[PDB]
């Protein structure tokens, strides 16, 4: 089996600049003057899409910012200049010998200017509360970079081990992320406290941002 090694596993490229992704094959994928190497990319929730076929041929419907090169065992995909929509995971594939094999993939992040999150907090609905559970939701909207600290303060005490985070993929149009933090408590533990707050720390915020509510009001 021909093993394909992609490098790097991930990279961040500035808007308008060049992204270079490598694929090394454990054997030659050349045959009779032709090279059997393809590049694909995949955006979240979608099937992969062909970019380059036979090492260096652009496919119809693909912008000419994508180009491929190399032969034998060393191959390169070039994206220049990168655009917001190029956030995706990129895969090489060899079709020279059975079984066909894929590279491990390269996740491309598009850089942009620092953008502080807008923060919203949501108390549990009355109808969930009646069923015996309280979900408290903290939302961080449209921020960059992805790294963010979301702490749950309950009567000004730090909570641990009872919240779960979820983060969107990088937005293909503005290159930001969004994040939700959900604090889950039983109804009886929820009633043990008055003030529920989520405190957000992020490179784009001068000082941490706190959104809170009083249980009941």
């Amino acid at each position: 089996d021909i093993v394909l090694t992609q490098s790097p596993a991930s990279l961040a490229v500035s808007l308008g600049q060049r992204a270079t992704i490598s694929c090394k094959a454990s054997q030659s994928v050349d045959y009779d003057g032709d090279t059997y190497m393809n590049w694909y990319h995949q955006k979240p929730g979608q099937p992969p899409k062909l970019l380059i076929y036979a090492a260096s041929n652009l496919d119809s419907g693909i912008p000419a910012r994508f180009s491929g090169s190399g032969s034998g065992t060393d191959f390169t995909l070039n994206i220049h200049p990168v655009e917001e929509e190029d956030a995706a995971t990129y895969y090489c594939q060899q079709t020279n010998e059975d079984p066909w094999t894929f590279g491990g993939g390269t996740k491309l992040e598009i850089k942009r200017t620092v953008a502080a999150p807008s923060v919203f907090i949501f108390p549990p609905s009355d109808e969930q509360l009646k069923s015996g559970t309280a979900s408290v939701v903290c939302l961080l909207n449209n921020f960059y970079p992805r790294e963010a600290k979301v702490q749950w303060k309950v009567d000004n005490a730090l909570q641990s081990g009872n919240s779960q985070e979820s983060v969107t993929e990088q937005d293909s149009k503005d290159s930001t992320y969004s994040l939700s933090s959900t604090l889950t408590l039983s109804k009886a533990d929820y009633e043990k406290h008055k003030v529920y707050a989520c405190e957000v720390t992020h490179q784009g915020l001068s000082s941490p941002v706190t959104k809170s509510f009083n249980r009941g009001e």
Partner: protein
């Protein structure tokens, strides 16, 4: 063209599962590709629907069986002896004669291997307060996936539907949020439309300022 794959499946450990892919006048090969959640791509094998000839990745020789019905241009894959490692998205892809690449892919079929039973979600509003945020908490369903739209698909800008997380109960949960002009909260109705096909449940929930 297009490749239409069958819907998401839930199957118990040790059972079998058959997935289908319908293409909608030439020779071509139907390949199948496995992608585990957030992971790499594995080539399973291909079949020629004209001759019925198949080739398998040796790693799937005992796991997968490829079948084609040329009468309706439908290709099938049978996965047997299912384990947790078989939970993944399975794609069908078409290779045209004279091509050494995939020209079209199906949208993929999610297979979940678990003894847990199907359960539909509960939907709770995330009630708002010049920009407001509102949303819906989609809680306690199994298996993946669930689809969320807003105003029957009319509202798409500003929508974020987060990836689901497995809760301590073993059921999935997600939230879908949208930012809207804060001045439209008293005039505009915002309804989330939740669809969970594995349990055949569709729920509409109004997200509005709490009384």
């Amino acid at each position: 063209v297009q490749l239409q794959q069958s819907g998401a499946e839930l199957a118990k450990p040790g059972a079998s599962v058959m997935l289908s892919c319908k293409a909608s006048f030439n020779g071509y090969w139907m390949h199948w590709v496995k992608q585990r959640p957030g992971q790499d791509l594995e080539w399973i094998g291909y079949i020629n629907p004209t001759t019925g000839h198949t080739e398998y990745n040796q790693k799937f020789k005992d796991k997968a069986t490829l079948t084609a019905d040329e009468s309706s241009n439908t290709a099938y894959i049978e996965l047997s002896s299912l384990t947790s490692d078989d939970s993944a998205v399975y794609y069908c892809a078409r290779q045209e004669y004279r091509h050494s690449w995939f020209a079209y892919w199906g949208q993929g079929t999610l297979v979940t291997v678990s003894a847990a039973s199907t359960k539909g979600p509960s939907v709770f509003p995330l009630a708002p307060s010049g920009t407001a945020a509102l949303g819906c908490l989609v809680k306690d369903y199994f298996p993946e996936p669930v689809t969320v739209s807003w105003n029957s698909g009319a509202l798409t800008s500003g929508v974020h539907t987060f990836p689901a997380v497995l809760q301590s109960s073993g059921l999935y949960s997600l939230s879908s949020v949208v930012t809207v002009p804060s001045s439209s909260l008293g005039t505009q109705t915002y309804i989330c439309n939740v669809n969970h096909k594995p349990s055949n449940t569709k729920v509409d929930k109004k997200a509005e300022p709490k009384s």
